[PDB]
């Protein structure tokens, strides 16, 4: 029986696999769809602050500039999102 | 209403906060406890392969050698765990 933490991690792999193309990477329109579908409250908190997270997320996370997001770059994105939530838990405003 | 993905991320912050000391970092015995409590099936799969993940995890993840695991180093650990699960989902053996 997996724990909540283990299920969470497995769920992130399964989420990545909803959006990959045949080359095992996520293209730009698919990454935006993934964000809208899985992080809509995160995105809404950004909006309220005047920030359109989807304007630049692909360009910021496509570190090797191959116009795809691979699993390592996907993990980096999740780490950015987690870092925002962590800042919020310390009293920061969202999407700072 | 948060989504499953957003709840997962928030859950990782709350998990980090179960184990921090006053300086907002996780010390070595606490990190091992966190692993045993939250990733026991992950650890058991390692064992079966002949790998004791807890022998070196602290030393591998304490990148700045301050004898604490801060949030950024905690995210790196989660990314290692996710990368293992991702490899498994592609047919690799666990804890490779
Ligand atoms: Ca890329
Ligand atoms: Ca450290
Ligand atoms: Cl893939
Ligand atoms: Cl903290
Ligand atoms: Zn994959
Ligand atoms: Zn904290």
Author numbering:
A (entry chain A), B (entry chain A): 1 to 96
The authors write:
Hallmarks of the S100 protein family include their small size (~ 100 aa) and the presence of a canonical (calmodulin-like) EF-hand motif and a non-canonical (S100-specific) EF-hand motif. While most S100 proteins share moderate sequence identity, S100A7 and S100A15 are 93% identical in sequence yet intriguingly display divergent functions. Intriguingly, however, S100A7 and S100A15 serve distinct roles in inflammatory skin disease; S100A7 signals through the receptor for advanced glycation products (RAGE) in a zinc-dependent manner, while S100A15 signals through a yet unidentified G-protein coupled receptor in a zinc-independent manner.
S100A7D24G eluted as a dimer from the SEC, and crystallized with one monomer in the asymmetric unit of the tetragonal cell. Diffraction data was collected to a resolution of 1.6 Å and the structure solved by molecular replacement. The S100A7D24G and S100A15 structures aligned closely with an r.m.s.d of 0.719 Å over 96 Cα atoms. Subtle adjustments were observed in the orientation of the histidine ligands, due to differential packing of surface loops between the monoclinic and tetragonal crystal forms. To validate the modeling of zinc at the dimer interface, we calculated an anomalous difference map using data collected at the zinc edge of 1.2482 nm. These observations indicate that the zinc-binding observed in the S100A15 is not an artifact. Similar to S100A15, a chloride ion was modeled as the exogenous fourth ligand to complete the distorted tetrahedral geometry.
